Design an enzyme around this catalytic site. Structure first.
Site, short mmCIF file in Angstrom:
data_model
loop_
_atom_site.label_atom_id
_atom_site.label_comp_id
_atom_site.label_asym_id
_atom_site.label_seq_id
_atom_site.Cartn_x
_atom_site.Cartn_y
_atom_site.Cartn_z
N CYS A 113 27.29 42.40 33.27
CA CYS A 113 28.10 41.46 34.06
C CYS A 113 29.48 41.28 33.42
O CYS A 113 29.60 40.72 32.33
CB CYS A 113 27.39 40.10 34.19
N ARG A 116 31.15 37.21 32.68
CA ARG A 116 30.52 36.20 31.84
C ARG A 116 31.48 35.29 31.10
O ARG A 116 30.99 34.42 30.37
CB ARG A 116 29.61 36.85 30.82
N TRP A 285 31.45 34.83 42.56
CA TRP A 285 32.42 35.35 43.50
C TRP A 285 32.62 36.83 43.20
O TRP A 285 32.10 37.36 42.22
CB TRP A 285 33.75 34.59 43.43
N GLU A 290 33.96 45.70 44.10
CA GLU A 290 32.58 45.72 44.59
C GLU A 290 32.54 45.97 46.10
O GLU A 290 31.67 46.71 46.58
CB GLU A 290 31.88 44.42 44.25
#
Ligand code: HEM
Ligand code: HEM
Ligand SMILES: N=C(Nc1cccc(CCNCc2cccc(NC(=N)c3cncs3)c2)c1)c1cncs1
Ligand SMILES: N=C(Nc1cccc(CCNCc2cccc(NC(=N)c3cncs3)c2)c1)c1cncs1
Ligand SMILES: C[C@H](O)[C@H](O)[C@H]1CNc2nc(N)[nH]c(=O)c2N1
Ligand SMILES: C[C@H](O)[C@H](O)[C@H]1CNc2nc(N)[nH]c(=O)c2N1
Ligand SMILES: [Zn+2]
Lengths: 416, 416
Positions: A113, A116, A285, A290
């Site tokens: 991720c 973070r 969000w 992506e």
């Protein structure tokens, strides 16, 4: 035992001791590296009482260490308490505080991720009193509304009752609370989102009246306490959407694309102190790429590079005109532009990757390390012009953690 | 023990047994993955006679297996022969055929190399009778000329005498036979190529008369049989260069950029049958992105995104206008276009990555596997719109192999 990771652009060196607290395993050995296998078996999930206390104690100690009472009376009595409860029921119950800590730190530990730096700003909704699919729909609607917050998105997780026997599991059968439908065609092509074609079918089987179009928000399919799952339609007024326009090419509206504001992943498993939460949907969000690169340009997704290149008047005959690359930068400028012009929270891959470097520095300092999965941290476009490309990362599995799990329809023992 | 790698775009599954023949180690353990450390210690290089024969036998067996005489009389007598020679001198000598096989298979085994579909079309030049730096210059000039071949580039390796005692080593002190000079400025900025600023200094110390400009081909610095290294200027008529123009933007010539046709890596170490070749420069041709993205756009390299974005009239105020991405696609279209318009061999990242998938399929079929380093195979731009992004890869170290080694000026015991 005190490992060094370097940035090959700034010459910065960080030292990693946190990997020593690592518990889970990776899939790699000393003879083979599997850092590019998608779902390693160590990333996927009936756990006994003999295994449960060490896990419970391991978690309880880092929680009390974190609030500056490691070994205090409160710690020992809670250690005693949970031990006693694992006797009575071979399981136990997290304090509300321990639930929030665990959730925030599973995020903190997610090595794939890039977001973070926000890990401690997370809103935990305790849905552990929920007993019915209708209860779940209600909790989930209140998650969607709170997290969306008028486009000013806020991170949040809703945690449904932990696994117990194994049968009586809570599961959200959607991969994301909000996803577009995938219908295939007579000619065999695909309408909508080819990723969810199997799930769309499942909803149609349970009785979804499909409005077979492109961007059709799927219903929720909720399994509570082990029972057969149940269909519910998110009130469309809760589903915030962004129409995709370009700031220079006015034909871009003609493409008539829209995506949803709120990414909210619901098929994963949260692990805290040896307790397993099979339903724990979480939202933040989007990073721009992506949607613009993966959702819109993966060949097995929407696959629009074809069309966008047409409207750009791009030399599509030779591969080496880089026309795919050129249509891809435009598609991503328009995703960003569209989202921002509407004050809907989005982050670009440059800003996100720089924050992750900044976050990584904090973690090595105050925490001794930061697990990171280069294969996933590096954006799917413009890799080396972002700082993470040149950052060496150590990957290892700390707990609390987010894990993968089978799709419920490969495991659920039916009766209806 | 029979591992599976999947492509997540085509759903193809390949099975890997070759990893079982793996000899070297990776750096990863079951508790930590180091697939993004640049130079792991298992990738870097006085080896004894007791260690040498197993290595020699291991190599000899796969060579004779390869030519369909595993265990034949020829195999056993050569096994006997090399054993006897490792007695006499605690080392041994590769047959010309074994040298070519070893070289081609070190390439074949290079898991970070996207170009290996060509691995068996390699021209091996045996320079093992070379005794002087002047001999080396001569061999290297004949490598440059043959490989360049008028822009129709041909792969080739020149193999200098193996390491023996350790002192008497042959080393090319350049990282590449052809590289541009790096001079820093009074203000502290950098002229030319910041990557080679330390090497340029070393050449200036040994007496290079630097023509302190931008694209200044460095001289060769050749160490033979352990002696202090020596400066030689490649005849400029052997150095083929490509001027970078754009096919749409005529201001692109004004940028006045040029790169060299022949990429030729000279600082690596070739290992065959436990024998170590410390100087073994090898050349092929460029994948476009190596120059356009890394050489031209790495912040610690030429770093021209600044300028190119200026001439494009790009909104350089906000990070999220994706102007860096947009200047990067143009810079790479012009590298390709310039090279092709001159019939100088180059390959684009789309064509290269598709060939590697094609090559990977062949290898799993006829060989049982193909070691691959995802972190390096995936191009530094447009990652996910190339097929390697979605290909799971297993990485492991097979031998014969190319290894890293220290820079000679950190190790060389001087006397002059
Ligand atoms: C706040 C804004 C956030 C941003 C910008 C962000 C960004 C990303 C991105 C780009 C990925 C790559 C995954 C993919 O491409 O499919 C990812 C993975 C992930 N994120 Fe974050 N994320 C955010 C919030 C969160 C939150 C709130 C959680 C949990 C509480 C979380 C947990 C994870 C996990 C578990 C993964 C990947 C694990 C896997 O698929 O194996 N993220 N994130
Ligand atoms: C024939 C055309 C070739 C192409 C298109 C090609 C392409 C590439 C590329 C793009 C890389 C990435 C490395 C970087 O970005 O710095 C690479 C790495 C590599 N190539 Fe190939 N290459 C070719 C020929 C060769 C040959 C002839 C050899 C040896 C005989 C070789 C051995 C290697 C090695 C050892 C590495 C990387 C190992 C490391 O840096 O740790 N390549 N190649
Ligand atoms: N099946 C395919 N891939 C695939 C298979 C299995 C798993 C995955 C990974 C999917 N992770 C989704 C995900 C997880 C976490 C964060 C994000 N992002 C966000 N911002 C957020 C979403 N919630 C809160 S933050 C997105 C991908 C393919 C089909 N075609 C080409 S690949
Ligand atoms: N020091 C930096 N990186 C860095 C450090 C150490 C090593 C490396 C890897 C360099 N491999 C060069 C290389 C190896 C093999 C092939 C190629 N390509 C080609 N086509 C060919 C070259 N010959 C034959 S084929 C190129 C990179 C940085 C500075 N600034 C930002 S990173
Ligand atoms: C830190 C990281 O390992 C480093 O940036 C690597 C990543 N992948 C790469 N891939 C290639 N082809 N060349 C490189 O220099 C690098 N650098
Ligand atoms: C095969 C490979 O592991 C796969 O493409 C991974 C690579 N890295 C990724 N990175 C992100 N963020 N998301 C992904 O889906 C993937 N897919
Ligand atoms: Zn690994």
């Amino acid at each position: 035992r005190f490992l060094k990771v370097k940035n090959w652009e700034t010459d910065v060196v960080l030292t990693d001791t946190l990997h020593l607290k690592s518990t889970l395993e990776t899939g790699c050995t000393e003879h083979i590296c599997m850092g590019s296998i998608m779902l390693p078996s160590q990333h996927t999930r009936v756990a006994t009482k003999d295994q449960l206390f060490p896990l419970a104690k391991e978690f309880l100690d880092q929680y009390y260490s974190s609030i500056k009472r490691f070994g205090s009376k409160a710690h020992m009595d809670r250690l005693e308490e949970v031990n006693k409860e694992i006797e009575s029921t071979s399981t136990y119950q997290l304090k509300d505080t321990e639930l929030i800590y665990g959730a925030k730190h599973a995020w903190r530990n997610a090595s794939r991720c890039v977001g973070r730096i926000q890990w401690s700003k997370l809103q935990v909704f305790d849905a552990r009193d929920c007993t019915t699919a209708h209860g779940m729909f209600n909790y989930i609607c209140n998650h969607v509304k709170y997290a969306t917050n008028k486009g000013n998105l806020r991170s949040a997780i809703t945690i449904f009752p932990q696994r117990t026997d194994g049968k009586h599991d809570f599961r959200v059968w959607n991969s994301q609370l909000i996803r577009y439908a995938g219908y295939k065609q007579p000619d065999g092509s695909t309408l909508g989102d080819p990723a969810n074609v199997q799930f769309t079918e499942i909803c149609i089987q349970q009785g979804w009246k499909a409005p077979r179009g492109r961007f059709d928000v799927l219903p929720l399919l909720l399994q509570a306490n082990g029972n057969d799952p149940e269909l519910f339609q998110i009130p469309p007024e809760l589903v915030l959407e962004v129409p995709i326009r370009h700031p220079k090419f006015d034909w871009f509206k003609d493409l008539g694309l829209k995506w949803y504001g709120l990414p909210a992943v619901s098929n994963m498993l949260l692990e805290i102190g040896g307790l397993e939460f099979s339903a724990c949907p979480f939202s933040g969000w989007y990073m721009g790429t992506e949607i613009g690169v993966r959702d819109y340009c993966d060949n097995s997704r929407y696959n629009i590079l074809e069309e966008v290149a047409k409207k750009m008047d791009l030399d599509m005959r030779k591969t080496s005109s880089l026309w795919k690359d050129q249509a891809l930068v435009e598609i991503n400028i328009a995703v960003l532009y569209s989202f921002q012009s509407d004050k809907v929270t989005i982050v670009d891959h440059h800003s996100a990757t720089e924050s992750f470097i900044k976050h990584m520095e904090n973690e090595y300092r105050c925490r001794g390390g930061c697990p990171a999965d280069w294969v996933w941290i590096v954006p799917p476009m413009s890799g080396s012009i972002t700082p993470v490309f040149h950052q060496e990362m150590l990957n290892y599995r700390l707990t609390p953690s987010f894990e993968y799990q089978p799709d419920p329809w490969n495991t659920h023992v039916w009766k209806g």
